[PDB]
Design an enzyme around this catalytic site. Structure first.
Site, mmCIF file in Angstrom:
data_model
loop_
_atom_site.group_PDB
_atom_site.id
_atom_site.type_symbol
_atom_site.label_atom_id
_atom_site.label_comp_id
_atom_site.label_asym_id
_atom_site.label_seq_id
_atom_site.Cartn_x
_atom_site.Cartn_y
_atom_site.Cartn_z
ATOM 1 N N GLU A 35 39.986 45.229 24.109
ATOM 2 C CA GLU A 35 40.700 44.861 25.111
ATOM 3 C C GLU A 35 42.150 46.068 24.412
ATOM 4 O O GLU A 35 42.235 46.542 25.412
ATOM 5 C CB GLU A 35 41.182 43.625 25.285
ATOM 6 N N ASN A 46 44.951 48.812 36.538
ATOM 7 C CA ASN A 46 43.929 48.440 37.152
ATOM 8 C C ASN A 46 43.151 49.016 38.697
ATOM 9 O O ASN A 46 44.269 49.621 39.512
ATOM 10 C CB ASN A 46 42.996 46.662 37.507
ATOM 11 N N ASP A 48 42.312 48.345 41.419
ATOM 12 C CA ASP A 48 43.124 47.950 43.200
ATOM 13 C C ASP A 48 44.652 47.325 42.821
ATOM 14 O O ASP A 48 45.237 46.453 43.631
ATOM 15 C CB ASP A 48 42.228 45.935 43.093
ATOM 16 N N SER A 50 46.208 46.000 40.431
ATOM 17 C CA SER A 50 47.240 45.521 39.210
ATOM 18 C C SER A 50 46.982 45.795 37.913
ATOM 19 O O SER A 50 46.542 46.903 37.839
ATOM 20 C CB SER A 50 46.201 43.823 39.314
ATOM 21 N N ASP A 52 46.827 45.632 33.806
ATOM 22 C CA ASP A 52 46.589 44.232 32.250
ATOM 23 C C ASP A 52 47.621 44.584 31.512
ATOM 24 O O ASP A 52 47.864 45.702 30.913
ATOM 25 C CB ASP A 52 45.078 44.321 31.755
ATOM 26 N N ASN A 59 46.053 39.804 33.290
ATOM 27 C CA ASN A 59 45.776 40.535 34.352
ATOM 28 C C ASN A 59 47.356 40.183 35.248
ATOM 29 O O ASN A 59 47.240 39.348 35.435
ATOM 30 C CB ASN A 59 44.670 40.495 35.039
ATOM 31 N N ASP A 101 39.344 27.718 32.633
ATOM 32 C CA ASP A 101 39.777 28.264 34.593
ATOM 33 C C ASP A 101 38.451 28.012 34.890
ATOM 34 O O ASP A 101 37.451 28.155 36.308
ATOM 35 C CB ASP A 101 40.545 29.740 34.715
#
Ligand SMILES: OCc1ccccc1
Ligand SMILES: [Cl-]
Ligand SMILES: [Cl-]
Ligand SMILES: [Cl-]
Ligand SMILES: [Cl-]
Ligand SMILES: [Cl-]
Ligand SMILES: [Cl-]
Ligand code: NA
Length: 129
Positions: A35, A46, A48, A50, A52, A59, A101
């Site tokens: 990562e 990202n 979209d 967003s 990280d 994110n 989650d």
């Protein structure tokens, strides 16, 4: 801060990630390697819109607030900049929420693609723990 491999393993273990939700320490170190290359200050945008943040590339679409991700949540209740600190407490506490989650560590695409099913124990080999 750029951690050493064994330094990060030690810090992660101290913060409760070793075998958290059944994921051994090697999984978490492997994830952090791919990562962020162990760099707490890593950020990546990202598609979209967003972003990280930090050693586990958490994110802004769901987990933290950066003030520039329309329609997003802040489920860890933290500014995204807190995820870039030399102290990994915020990143760890947030990763605990994420891995809990429903999808486990598959939430980290690099973990699924590069760590999952591999000899992750090698990432903590030789480490004074
Ligand atoms: O780098 C993927 C990721 C982002 C946010 C939370 C978990 C995993
Ligand atoms: Cl390494
Ligand atoms: Cl391991
Ligand atoms: Cl919004
Ligand atoms: Cl904030
Ligand atoms: Cl730390
Ligand atoms: Cl799981
Ligand atoms: Na936002």
């Amino acid at each position: 801060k750029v951690f050493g491999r064994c330094e990060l393993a030690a810090a992660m273990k101290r913060h409760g990630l070793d075998n958290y939700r059944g994921y051994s320490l090697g999984n978490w170190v492997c994830a952090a390697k791919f990562e962020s290359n162990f760099n707490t200050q890593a950020t990546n945008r990202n598609t979209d819109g967003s972003t990280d943040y930090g050693i586990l590339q958490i994110n802004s679409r769901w987990w933290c607030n950066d003030g520039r991700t329309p329609g997003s949540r802040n489920l860890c209740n933290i500014p995204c900049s807190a995820l870039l600190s030399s102290d990994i407490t915020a990143s760890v506490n947030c990763a605990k929420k994420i891995v809990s989650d429903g999808n486990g560590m598959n939430a980290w695409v690099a973990w699924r693609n590069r760590c999952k099913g591999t000899d992750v124990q090698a990432w903590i080999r030789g480490c004074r723990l």
